[PDB]
Design an enzyme around this catalytic site. Structure first.
Site, PDB file in Angstrom:
ATOM      1  N   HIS A 142      -7.842 -10.548  -2.783  1.00  0.00           N
ATOM      2  CA  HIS A 142      -7.553 -10.485  -1.356  1.00  0.00           C
ATOM      3  C   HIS A 142      -8.431 -11.565  -0.754  1.00  0.00           C
ATOM      4  CE1 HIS A 142      -7.673  -9.244   2.860  1.00  0.00           C
ATOM      5  NE2 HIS A 142      -8.984  -9.378   2.763  1.00  0.00           N
ATOM      6  N   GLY A 170      -7.388   2.308   7.875  1.00  0.00           N
ATOM      7  CA  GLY A 170      -8.604   3.108   7.932  1.00  0.00           C
ATOM      8  C   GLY A 170      -9.848   2.321   8.328  1.00  0.00           C
ATOM      9  N   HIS A 198      -2.715 -13.855   0.754  1.00  0.00           N
ATOM     10  CA  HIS A 198      -3.006 -14.130   2.158  1.00  0.00           C
ATOM     11  C   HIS A 198      -3.572 -15.530   2.323  1.00  0.00           C
ATOM     12  CE1 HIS A 198      -3.064  -9.826   1.577  1.00  0.00           C
ATOM     13  NE2 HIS A 198      -2.913  -9.642   2.876  1.00  0.00           N
ATOM     14  N   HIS A 252       0.885  -1.147   0.000  1.00  0.00           N
ATOM     15  CA  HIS A 252       0.000   0.000   0.000  1.00  0.00           C
ATOM     16  C   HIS A 252       0.928   1.202   0.000  1.00  0.00           C
ATOM     17  CE1 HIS A 252      -3.271  -2.720   0.818  1.00  0.00           C
ATOM     18  NE2 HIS A 252      -2.408  -3.352   1.592  1.00  0.00           N
ATOM     19  N   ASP A 265       2.577  -6.967   1.968  1.00  0.00           N
ATOM     20  CA  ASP A 265       1.365  -6.264   2.329  1.00  0.00           C
ATOM     21  C   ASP A 265       1.811  -5.143   3.277  1.00  0.00           C
ATOM     22  OD1 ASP A 265      -1.404  -5.795   2.303  1.00  0.00           O
ATOM     23  OD2 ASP A 265      -1.656  -6.844   4.225  1.00  0.00           O
ATOM     24  N   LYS A 318      -7.038  -5.417  -8.849  1.00  0.00           N
ATOM     25  CA  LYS A 318      -7.122  -6.032  -7.531  1.00  0.00           C
ATOM     26  C   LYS A 318      -8.593  -6.069  -7.123  1.00  0.00           C
ATOM     27  CE  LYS A 318      -6.813  -6.242  -2.825  1.00  0.00           C
ATOM     28  NZ  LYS A 318      -5.888  -5.536  -1.935  1.00  0.00           N
TER      29      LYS A 318
END
Ligand SMILES: NC(=O)C[C@H](N)C(=O)O
Ligand SMILES: [Zn+2]
Ligand SMILES: [Zn+2]
Length: 374
Positions: free
Chosen positions: A201, A76, A230, A70, A285, A162
């Site tokens: 993801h 957030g 992941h 990122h 990540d 993504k």
């Protein structure tokens, strides 16, 4: 005399070169950010103004390619206070990262692709290689130009899209919207000479990879484009990822997760399962969560130490495997023609020097080149 320093000639000699495939004590001649020679024992005077560097007793391998960062920030998921900061250049170069793929996570309301694109380009100017994935957990994807296919196609730094599935923070995407999305990434990629991948993801849903299988039925996007990440977040899902990798697909393991399946434990189980390392990559990540990039180098080390992987095989999921999945021409491998993205390590694998496109990023284990405002 005549001036030849424009070529920035540099010779890395007498190091135990892993490209990643274990060669011996090889020498590497670099010119204009390019590896122009790889053959043991090269003349320290073969080329004019040559910055000759003695790496005797040191390891030399390709810099890491981290495809899950990122770059402009993330988080957030617990209010605006939990919005993580942007990534610092030195942070990357010190963890041995020379090529990175930025992306957005859950927050796609206070984080936009135009900013990521901007951060990606700023990184490339500063010395490293950066690309980005368009979209975010959200489907349909919030793009830059209006469609995923168009983004991947004409935005020079987008290599694919993504999204997020089997997660409690998704947009609850249905097979059609999902399939269409991937198809656009795939077509776009062909038009732009991009891998046109779709990174998923993975969440902690029981469904796990079922959406990725459901997608295969409703379209014809090659399975070599669907990359779940992941996968080591929960065992039931990891097990499936392995089965998915056994079918020709590639799987991404995040070094920022240490349980129930640790990174090393992950790359390890795959081999035991009989999966060519080619279909296994390791991502950080980083700057997510605030995640760091230390765990990338640590996953290599531990792989060679705790487990019984060799230096060469340990590096693959962080170089050649990644490079071969995104088709990052000229990276993840040390050969004439490829980019001079290098890492000088100790025999114990502790990054000492870092080179990115010829330029020296890390001198004494600490970056000597930094972002404009660090
Ligand atoms: N909620 C989470 O598990 C964190 C999320 N998977 C991330 O990439 O940071
Ligand atoms: Zn994620
Ligand atoms: Zn993430």
């Amino acid at each position: 005399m005549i001036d030849y320093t424009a070529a920035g000639f540099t010779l890395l000699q007498g190091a135990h070169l892993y490209a990643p495939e274990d060669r011996g004590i090889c020498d590497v001649l670099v010119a204009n950010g390019k590896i122009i020679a790889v053959a043991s024992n090269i003349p320290s005077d073969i080329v004019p103004n040559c910055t000759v560097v003695d790496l005797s007793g040191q390891i030399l391998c390709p810099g890491f390619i981290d495809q899950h960062v990122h770059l402009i920030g993330g988080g957030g998921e617990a209010g605006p206070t939990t919005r993580t900061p942007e990534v610092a250049l030195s942070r990357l170069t010190e963890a041995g990262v020379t090529s990175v793929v930025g992306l957005l996570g859950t927050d796609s309301i206070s984080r936009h692709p135009e900013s990521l694109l901007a951060k990606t380009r700023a990184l490339n100017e500063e010395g490293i290689s950066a690309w980005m994935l368009t979209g975010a957990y959200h489907v349909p994807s919030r793009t830059i130009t209006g469609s995923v296919e168009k983004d991947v196609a004409i935005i020079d730094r987008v290599i694919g899209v993504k999204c997020a599935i089997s997660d409690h923070r998704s947009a609850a995407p249905d097979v059609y919207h999902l399939a269409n999305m991937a198809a656009e990434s795939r077509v776009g990629g062909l038009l732009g000479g991009k891998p046109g991948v779709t990174v998923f993801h993975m969440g902690d849903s029981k469904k796990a990879l079922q959406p990725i299988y459901d997608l295969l039925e409703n379209c014809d996007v090659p399975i070599s484009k669907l990359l779940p990440t992941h996968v080591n977040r929960n065992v039931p899902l990891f097990e499936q990822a392995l089965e998915f990798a056994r079918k020709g697909g590639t799987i991404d393991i995040t070094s920022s997760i240490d349980e129930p399946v640790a990174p090393a434990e992950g790359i390890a189980r795959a081999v035991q399962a009989g999966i060519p390392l080619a279909r296994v990559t390791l991502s950080s990540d980083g700057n997510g969560s605030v995640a760091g990039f230390e765990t990338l180098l640590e996953t290599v080390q531990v792989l060679v130490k705790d487990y019984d992987f060799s230096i060469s095989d340990a590096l693959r999921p962080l170089t050649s495997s990644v490079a071969g999945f995104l088709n990052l021409t000229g990276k993840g491998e040390i050969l004439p023609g490829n980019d001079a993205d290098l890492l000088v390590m100790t025999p114990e694998l502790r990054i000492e020097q870092v080179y990115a496109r010829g330029k020296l990023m890390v001198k004494d284990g600490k970056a000597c080149v930094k972002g404009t405002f660090e």
